[PDB]
Motif scaffolding. Structure first.
Motif: not given
Lengths: 456, 469
Positions: A171-173, A219-220, A222-223, A226-227
């Protein structure tokens, strides 16, 4: 934690003859599958060198993916190198022999001569839906792909099941920061320490935009993390550092502009009026009959964006390529050169360049195109000749006769800037450097001690 | 023998977030300077890994060029890695400190913290003509470049003198072979042996052409061996393998078409006549009023090529994109759709899409485009209705009012294929696969005459056999 190394074999890439496009695809695809790529290596078509690199990578990583060097010529020596690295011997594989025999099979003997311990993987070409010509050869944890880029993308897509890590999903932001890397480095360090292993926070500059200088990447596996880091950073970083930047110009611009128009805001009403005039423009004349005056400045930038938004929704089925009229009279600014080329590239514009006064260019245009009958103008109510202007004003008698359309007639400087920034429209960078007007070299100065903060 | 290794630093490159473009520029530049690049290596933002690769490359090669990891953040750790690699200690170099202090210098201390054995190399930015913000840092034979591709290109341009090899000059030349790689593999092996270390010979397939399958590459320090090998191979390889192909199907087509027209040959006369009709067409109507009927096939391909040449000759100034009308078969072939897509970019056409009967598409068009009044057609006089057809024929009363212009009326199948091949015009790949006529998917089949595992379309010697497929 499934890792992979990549070995691209090719004399040409090292020489510079051709660019390497396989590495980006391989890395991106392997990221999507849950595999962490830890190294990449470009090596010449030498048996000893390839065999050394294969041995190292095989010992170090879960998967090894080699690209190139499995052709029938003498310079193709990947199979031989792989044989050497694992103490195997090259042997004709009966199934690859049959594959070559089903087709012409002239001089293809080298294509079936593989390490004895090799295993074959058959798959489906995603483009044809039919099986590949030859299976994928593997040896221990080393998978031998071809170097032909089209074929490489097809084969990797077809055989990606072999590499899927089920345990991991990445999962990436992405975040856009208007501050330089030096200022926010300490906050990033503190955040990375506070979060440690849960998530990886990185930074890199990207230089060519009016809205951000740096891009942060979170980057992780899990979601959630990130938040959580988003909140942490939005707090630590000074307020407004982050920008909700979107690539709008090309596609979303149509709906984004229309949304701003339907909103109940002052700027929304100004946009609604300009768009109503532009729609009438399209209803009186064919687009082949219209053209947009473009000097490089903001007024023309906003006019072009509005015309694009209106044209797309009004006329989706028709190709509707945009035409513009560009006048040069003074030695171009360097930033202006770059911006003008960039703009015509983005919008796919038609430049019919006359060099001189607008009227002169208008005569040239009447000559080049008999169908053109009207010109869109970025004249405004702040610009002189303001009381005389109408939305539709005809050209003076001396000039060549064209009927000018002024959608931005009632727009004000503040409105131009609000409209450009709210939708993240690109403009000449000189405006960001403190210049309030783009003029000739003798004409231009900076009045402030950015341009979009000046009130008048 | 000046060798070089390259180390690309950056996690983002590996994860796939961004592509690496520094490597192409570095390799091309270093070859132009006379330096042979022997390896490239992409490594993560880790001190140990970078230092290992640095030690290895430094010991083995003349030059080592590092890109990335000299930023001011913590994830940028090239300077520390190099310090480790050479057993040196990090100490601020006063000149870099003065540089950082010249500007605000907030959080820039890490930019002046370099190995104690570091050496500075000052240059001037080629875009501004002004001196660089910061100098190029060197340690042993290791040069630390920045990672931003724009800035890296600027810096390499400014300081490339540091790597110039006077002793060596590289010569490179490429050849187009219309043959499978396997057939020339033995000849290539023999030629390479014959030349040994005088010249380096490579080969690679290139997929997107009607005229060649493989590209041969000769590389050497002198020009003589290249010419020698050209002669050797031209003799060894079977006749016709080598092709003088040029990608000027669009830019040089203008002069070539008219050159062929001026020739006193059957095909030359055919081209001259078609062009005369097309010039008359341009004299009757404006380009806004014309559009080319283009279904992707051979006839329309040649028509578009001739129309393009005529336009570029009479109106070199007029940049207007030519308009074309595309009719889609109830079941188009995918390869033909792709060829049409490739064509729209080659010629920069504007497409007025429509499906159904020609009559139906025209009804939609006159609504979409009222200004349009005439259409160029690639019809030929095979059947009697076409023998009755004239160069300028209006549409039947029922149809919508347009003027059909048929420049290719008297052209013959052999003439079409000769015109396309002689000028190396690109055409749909399906024709090479044994289809002599492209229709809807359910109607068309590979032409049996061309079977033997199917032969190209341009060798069918009978024009009437094209019509049956």
């Amino acid at each position: 934690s499934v890792t992979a190394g990549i070995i691209i074999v090719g004399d040409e890439i090292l020489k510079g003859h051709t660019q390497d496009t396989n590495t980006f695809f391989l890395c991106r695809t392997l990221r999507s599958l849950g595999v962490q790529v830890c190294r990449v290596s470009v090596v010449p078509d030498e048996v000893a060198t390839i065999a050394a690199e294969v041995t190292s990578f095989s010992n170090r990583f879960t998967h090894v993916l080699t690209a190139g060097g499995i052709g029938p010529t003498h310079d193709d020596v990947t199979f031989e190198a792989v044989a050497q690295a694992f103490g195997d011997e090259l042997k004709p594989h009966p199934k690859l022999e049959a594959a070559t025999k089903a087709l012409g099979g002239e001089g293809w003997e080298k294509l079936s001569l593989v390490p004895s311990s090799a295993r074959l993987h058959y798959g489906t070409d995603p483009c044809t839906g039919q099986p590949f010509r030859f299976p994928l050869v593997s040896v221990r944890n080393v998978y031998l792909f071809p170097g032909i880029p089209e074929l490489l993308r097809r084969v990797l897509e077809g055989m990606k099941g072999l590499f899927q890590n089920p345990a991991v999903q990445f999962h990436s932001k992405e975040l856009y920061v208007a501050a330089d890397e030096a200022s926010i480095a300490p906050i990033l360090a503190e955040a990375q320490a506070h979060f440690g292993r849960r998530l990886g926070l990185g930074s890199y500059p990207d230089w060519g935009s009016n809205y951000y200088q740096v891009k942060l990447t979170l980057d992780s596996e899990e979601e959630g993390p990130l938040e959580e880091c988003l909140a942490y950073l939005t707090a630590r970083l000074p307020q407004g550092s982050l920008v909700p930047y979107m690539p709008n110009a090309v596609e979303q611009a149509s709906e984004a502009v229309y949304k701003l128009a339907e909103s109940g805001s002052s700027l929304g009403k100004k946009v609604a009026g300009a768009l109503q005039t532009i729609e009438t423009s399209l209803a009186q004349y064919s687009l082949t009959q219209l053209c947009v005056g473009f000097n490089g400045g903001k007024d023309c930038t906003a006019l072009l964006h509005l015309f694009h938004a209106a044209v797309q929704r009004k006329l989706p089925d028709v190709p509707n390529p945009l035409q513009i009229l560009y006048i040069r009279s003074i030695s171009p600014f360097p930033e202006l050169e770059q911006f003008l080329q960039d703009t015509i590239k983005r919008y796919n514009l038609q430049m019919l360049e006359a060099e001189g006064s607008m009227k002169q260019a208008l005569g040239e245009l009447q000559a080049r195109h008999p169908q053109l009958e009207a010109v869109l103008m970025g004249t405004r109510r702040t610009d002189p000749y303001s009381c005389s202007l109408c939305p539709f004003s005809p050209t003076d008698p001396g000039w060549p006769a064209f009927m000018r359309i002024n959608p931005l007639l009632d727009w004000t400087y503040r409105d131009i800037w609000d409209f450009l920034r709210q939708l993240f429209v690109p403009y000449c960078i000189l405006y960001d450097r403190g210049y309030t007007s783009l003029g000739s070299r003798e004409n231009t100065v900076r009045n402030p001690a950015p341009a979009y903060l000046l009130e008048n």
